[PDB]
Every structure is written in C-alpha cells, then in structure tokens.
Nucleic acid binder design. Structure first.
Ligand SMILES: [Cl-]
Ligand SMILES: [Cl-]
Ligand SMILES: [Cl-]
Ligand SMILES: [Mg+2]
Ligand SMILES: [Mg+2]
Ligand SMILES: [Rb+]
Ligand SMILES: [Rb+]
Ligand SMILES: [Rb+]
Ligand SMILES: [Rb+]
Length: 136
RNA sequence: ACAU
DNA sequence: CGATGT
C-alpha cells in the first residue's frame, strides 16, 4: 500500500540476458548507492536479482540493521525464501563464476539467520525501483 | 497470466 | 523483437 522509505532497494542490471550482470543496493529514501557488484561476464537477470537480495541481507546483518529489502523480482524473492536458486542457465566453463557466486549465496543462506523482511517493490503503482539501472 |  | 522465471 505505502512505500516503507526506511529500507534498502536492490536491483540487477545487464548487457544481454543472459549476458554481463551486475547489481547494486541503494537507500530507498535518498538513492545513495550502498554497494555495487563488479560486472560478472555471463549470468541471467534472475541470478543477479537473487545475488542482490542475498548481498543485501549480508550487508544489513553486518551493520545490525533491521531495515527491510525491496526487490522487483518475484522470482528472486521466492528463490531466497526457498534458499534455492532454480536457474536454467547451463553450468559450464563460461558460466562458472555466476554459478560459484549463486552456490556461495545459497550456502550463506543455509548457515546464517536473519529477520529482514524481503518485500516486493510494486512497480505498477510506484514506478521503477530506486536501484534500477535506467537501461530499459 | 504475472514478475523481470 | 529477444531473454529469464513462477
Ligand atoms: Cl554475489
Ligand atoms: Cl517490513
Ligand atoms: Cl513476491
Ligand atoms: Mg529488477
Ligand atoms: Mg531494473
Ligand atoms: Rb551481527
Ligand atoms: Rb533498466
Ligand atoms: Rb521492473
Ligand atoms: Rb514467458
């Protein structure tokens, strides 16, 4: 209904899908960029959205912050809830890095706790999430 | 259909 | 127009 302004917003950006993937997290209220991942040569939109949420969880936990996380990705929200990224991307030498990061993010979820609410950013009502890359 |  | 996902 209403935006929770005291939150972290995350989003993926890419060049192609599959293609070069990056992600970032921003303060929803101010747009300040709080973290940005260096581009990964091949990944999917959904793998990047998943990594962005998990990085957000780790970032907030390290800082003892109870803020929620907004994501626009129905898929990634579910994958984090399930602790399992059900990507179709081929596992081969070209995709080794993205898959290593996804495997490591799942591993973190299976070995740590968090209370962070993971909320759907309601793009249809609110416009683009504040972490968006402005590329579409 | 919906979400990217 | 193409892709990734539930
Ligand atoms: Cl990562
Ligand atoms: Cl909340
Ligand atoms: Cl959702
Ligand atoms: Mg997104
Ligand atoms: Mg975006
Ligand atoms: Rb802590
Ligand atoms: Rb975009
Ligand atoms: Rb979107
Ligand atoms: Rb589809």
């Amino acid at each position: 209904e209403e935006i929770i302004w005291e939150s972290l917003s995350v989003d993926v950006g890419s060049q192609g899908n599959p293609g070069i993937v990056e992600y970032k997290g921003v303060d929803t209220k101010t747009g300040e960029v709080l973290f940005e991942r260096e581009p990964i040569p091949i990944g999917t939109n959904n793998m990047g959205e998943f990594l962005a949420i998990v990085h957000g969880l780790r970032y907030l936990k390290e800082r003892n912050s109870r803020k929620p996380i907004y994501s626009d990705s129905q898929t990634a929200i579910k994958w984090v809830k399930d602790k399992k990224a059900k990507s179709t991307l081929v596992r081969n030498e070209e995709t080794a890095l993205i898959w290593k990061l996804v495997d490591e993010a799942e591993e973190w979820l299976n070995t740590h706790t968090y209370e962070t609410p993971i909320l759907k950013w309601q793009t249809d009502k609110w416009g683009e999430i504040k972490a968006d890359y402005g590329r579409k």
